[PDB]
């Protein structure tokens, strides 16, 4: 543990020298001249081990690594070199590991508003790998976030930045982290839901994730994409333009097909989405009737899973109370 203690001292000393340069306004400190990259690389690697993490927390490892990432972003911005990119990647990975399951660490990092702004800015880095790392941090922070953390996550603009980021990522690994963070954020409040729906192209993109073809034989993208959609579907139900985006990217039929998934996550998401979209709109009701939605939702009403049971029943009630004019034996 005194290797760890030594590396953290290196990082704190470097930060202090950066803070002195900032407050002066001594040349501008350069992380390369203080061998910062190796120091954070090693800490990042130790952060994967549970015992080493606990040692690291006694030394305020989270605080110090966050302070380093923050000060480097402030000093050099996104007009930074590969040394800086690398440093931020390794710092970001450590922050991901240190925030995982850790109530105190999540609260500390979300209280660091400057650091939070720095993190969000990194979603436009030239390194898509760095975007994935930062989205992994934001995912942990948005999971079981307290009231102050929810407030800071929203006020630093993480939702719009993550949704915009999602539209530009190429790799499935980046998309998974980005969509997972958005799924967590989309449950926090109604403003987060509105901010997602307001990004041009987001609703169509999200519908596209419902039929994602994973190379890695997993459902992660479909689950998160569908979870985001279920969370924002309350507002989509109020906006005819947004409903139309869903219709013309084949959202309704795909949601009915999700009701057969082995993933209870996929089934629950789809039931929740169908619950909200089956309300009021007679043309969406008729479309669902015509696709056999009634018997499909009826098959799920005795689920042990509380949300599948309630959602499937609620959707069914909406349809049964609004049998289309054409069905009435006819006419």
């Amino acid at each position: 543990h005194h290797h760890m203690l030594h590396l953290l001292e290196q990082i704190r000393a470097y930060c202090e020298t950066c803070w002195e340069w900032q407050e002066a306004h001594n040349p501008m400190p350069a992380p390369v001249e203080h061998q910062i990259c190796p120091a954070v690389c090693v800490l990042m690697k130790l952060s994967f081990d549970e015992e080493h993490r606990h040692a690291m927390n006694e030394l305020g490892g989270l605080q110090a690594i966050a302070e380093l990432l923050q000060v480097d972003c402030e000093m050099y911005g996104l007009t930074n070199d590969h040394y800086s990119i690398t440093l931020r990647r390794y710092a970001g990975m450590a922050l991901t590991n240190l925030t995982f399951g850790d109530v105190a660490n999540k609260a500390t990092l979300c209280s660091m508003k400057g650091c939070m702004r720095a993190l969000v800015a990194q979603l436009k880095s030239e390194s898509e790998d760095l975007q994935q790392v930062i989205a992994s941090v934001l995912r942990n922070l948005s999971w079981r976030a307290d009231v102050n953390s929810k407030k800071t996550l929203r006020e630093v603009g993480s939702v719009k930045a993550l949704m915009e980021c999602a539209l530009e990522v190429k790799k499935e690994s980046t998309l998974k982290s980005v969509l997972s963070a958005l799924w967590n954020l989309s449950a926090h409040c109604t403003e987060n839901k509105a901010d997602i729906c307001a990004v041009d192209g987001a609703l169509a993109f999200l519908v596209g994730t419902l039929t994602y073809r994973s190379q890695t034989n997993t459902l992660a993208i479909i689950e998160s994409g569908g979870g985001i959609l279920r969370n924002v579907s309350s507002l989509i139900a109020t906006n005819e333009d947004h409903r139309q985006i869903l219709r013309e990217n084949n959202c309704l039929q795909t949601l009915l097909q999700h009701l057969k998934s082995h993933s209870l996550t996929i089934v629950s998401n789809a039931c929740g989405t169908l619950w909200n979209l089956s309300a009021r709109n007679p043309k969406d009701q008729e479309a669902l009737w015509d696709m056999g939605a009634v018997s499909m939702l009826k098959n799920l009403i005795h689920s042990k899973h509380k949300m599948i049971a309630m959602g499937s029943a609620a959707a069914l009630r909406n349809l049964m109370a609004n049998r289309p004019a054409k069905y009435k034996d006819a006419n």
Binding site: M93, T96, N97, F100, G101, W143, R144, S180, S224
Partner: peptide, 7 residues
């Protein structure tokens, strides 16, 4: 979506 370690 939950939380996870870096991967």
């Amino acid at each position: 979506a939950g939380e996870a370690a870096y991967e």
